[PDB]
Amino acid sequence: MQSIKCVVVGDGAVGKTCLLICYTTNAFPKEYIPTVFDNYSAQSAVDGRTVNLNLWDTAGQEEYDRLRTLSYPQTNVFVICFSIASPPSYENVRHKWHPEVCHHCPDVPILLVGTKKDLRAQPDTLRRLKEQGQAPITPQQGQALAKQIHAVRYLECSALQQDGVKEVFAEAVRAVLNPTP
Amino acid sequence: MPPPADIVKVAIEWPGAYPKLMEIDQKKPLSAIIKEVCDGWSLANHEYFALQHADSSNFYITEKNRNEIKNGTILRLTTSPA
Ligand SMILES: Nc1nc2c(ncn2[C@@H]2O[C@H](COP(=O)(O)OP(=O)(O)O)[C@@H](O)[C@H]2O)c(=O)[nH]1
Ligand SMILES: [Mg+2]
């Protein structure tokens, strides 16, 4: 077979842990626990081929900045997440996450992922964001950010609904096995 | 008063090698932990090595203080002092 190291990064609470646990266990975490680091594995059929994924969960908090970058050596692909329901986490892709992974792993492919798409049209989220003068990220905005940071692709998912999660990691594999110029 | 955790997550650096992110079994002797760490970096003679805080304190890790290590602490593999 063939293994691939995939690290998932992004702001605290954007949904990194639920993404990974849903993908690898088909269960949605019952309780939020801050991540320190976690190494998961998956074997996935991707375009008729069986691939091993060596998956890493990271702490998004600035408190663990140095710890997180110790997980980056030998990474083959980064999945950078922002929450569709938190525009500040989108801006931190531009200001923190994309520059940090490129600083540590020059030219390593990046998949951009908008999480929690089930919240985009939820009235309560819409009302809470409106009190902050905000609105959920649109798919076109997600594409525009992917273009800006030279991500291989923008994808959206809801780990809670188990909607689009499989496709994120299949595209991560393709970024390593079928490099695009 | 609550007891310490029996497993703790740490990162360990060895200058020139790739870092190791691992969970430490706190019921396992520190020497066995160091042997596991050393094995990963193709190092033998583990009793000639020690773990020390990577941050500015640079305290050495011992059987008597390993209970104070929190999850997410960065350690450095070094030569034992004595
Ligand atoms: N509505 C919704 N909530 C989510 C989703 N994924 C995660 N969450 C919630 O968002 C919070 C943070 O999720 P988590 O995966 O731990 O984020 P992390 O801090 O990036 O690891 C938790 O309360 C989760 O239940 C999702 O797809 N939809
Ligand atoms: Mg997490």
Numbering used by the authors:
A (entry chain A): 1 to 181
B (entry chain B): 1 to 82
The article reads:
More recently, the scaffold protein engulfment and cell motility protein 1 (ELMO1) was discovered as an effector of RhoG to activate Rac1 and the downstream actin polymerization. The current model suggests the GTP-bound RhoG recruits the ELMO1 N-terminal RBD to the plasma membrane, while the C-terminal PH domain stabilizes binding of DOCK DHR-2 domain to Rac1. The solution structure showed that residues 7-80 of ELMO1 create the core RBD domain consisting of a four-stranded β-sheet, two 310-helices and one α-helix (β1: Ile7-Glu13, β2: Lys20-Asp25, α1: Leu30-Gly40, 310_1: His46-Tyr48, β3: Phe49-His53, 310_2: Arg66-Glu68, β4: Thr73-Thr79, respectively). In this study, we have determined the structure of ELMO1-RBD alone and in complex with RhoG, and verified its targetability through computational nanobody design.
